[PDB]
């Protein structure tokens, strides 16, 4: 499923992402936009460490979910990476929450640092009724 901006903004709000660990909805919108373009079935294989980024948030298999083919990987979200390719994003959000519960917080994703940090994210939720 590929969300439309405002449709995603409300779906994330309903799932309690607005201000989760101090992170605004706009930051989450900026993250999903740059990570997948709001596409829940987006995937990226990294040939260097044989890991794969799954879903709307491009969550990595080395640490967050199990796909059985990433060497010496862990499963912090206690999910099959398949759960991260669902049209329903509730599991991906539960995992994105797990990710920011760690030291780095939202900075865990380099793309966020690149295109959202200290940038104007206001534009991502304007008109969405959030």
UniProtKB/Swiss-Prot annotation:
Disulfide pattern: 6-128, 30-116, 65-81, 77-95
GO cellular component: azurophil granule lumen; extracellular exosome; extracellular region; extracellular space; specific granule lumen; tertiary granule lumen
Catalytic activity: Hydrolysis of (1->4)-beta-linkages between N-acetylmuramic acid and N-acetyl-D-glucosamine residues in a peptidoglycan and between N-acetyl-D-glucosamine residues in chitodextrins
Keyword annotations: Amyloid, Amyloidosis, Antimicrobial, Bacteriolytic enzyme, Disease variant, Disulfide bond, Glycosidase, Hydrolase, Secreted, Signal
Chief location category: secreted
GO molecular function: identical protein binding; lysozyme activity
Residues annotated as catalytic: 35, 53
Pfam families, per the entry: Lys
Keyword Signal part of the UniProt annotation: yes
Summary of subunit composition and partner proteins: Monomer.
Note, other: Lysozyme C is capable of both hydrolysis and transglycosylation; it also shows a slight esterase activity. It acts rapidly on both peptide-substituted and unsubstituted peptidoglycan, and slowly on chitin oligosaccharides.
Annotated family: Belongs to the glycosyl hydrolase 22 family.
Function: Lysozymes have primarily a bacteriolytic function; those in tissues and body fluids are associated with the monocyte-macrophage system and enhance the activity of immunoagents.
PANTHER family hit by this protein: LYSOZYME C
Disorder association: Amyloidosis, hereditary systemic 5: A form of hereditary systemic amyloidosis, a disorder characterized by amyloid deposition in multiple tissues resulting in a wide clinical spectrum. AMYLD5 primarily affects the viscera, and the predominant clinical features are renal dysfunction of varying severity, and intra-abdominal bleeding. Inheritance is autosomal dominant.
Protein name from the UniProt record: Lysozyme C
Native source organism of the sequence: Homo sapiens (Human)
């Amino acid at each position: 499923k590929v969300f439309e901006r405002c449709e995603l903004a409300r779906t994330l709000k309903r799932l309690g992402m607005d201000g989760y660990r101090g992170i605004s909805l706009a930051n989450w919108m900026c993250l999903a936009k740059w990570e997948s373009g709001y596409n829940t079935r987006a995937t990226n294989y990294n040939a260097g460490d044989r890991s794969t980024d799954y879903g709307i948030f491009q969550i990595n298999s080395r640490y967050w979910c199990n796909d059985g083919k990433t060497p010496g990987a862990v499963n912090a979200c206690a999910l099959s990476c398949s759960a991260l390719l669902q049209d329903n994003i509730a599991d991906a959000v539960a995992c994105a929450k797990r990710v920011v519960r760690d030291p780095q917080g939202i900075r865990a994703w380099v793309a966020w640092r690149n295109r959202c940090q200290n940038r104007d994210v206001r534009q991502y939720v304007q008109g969405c009724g959030v």
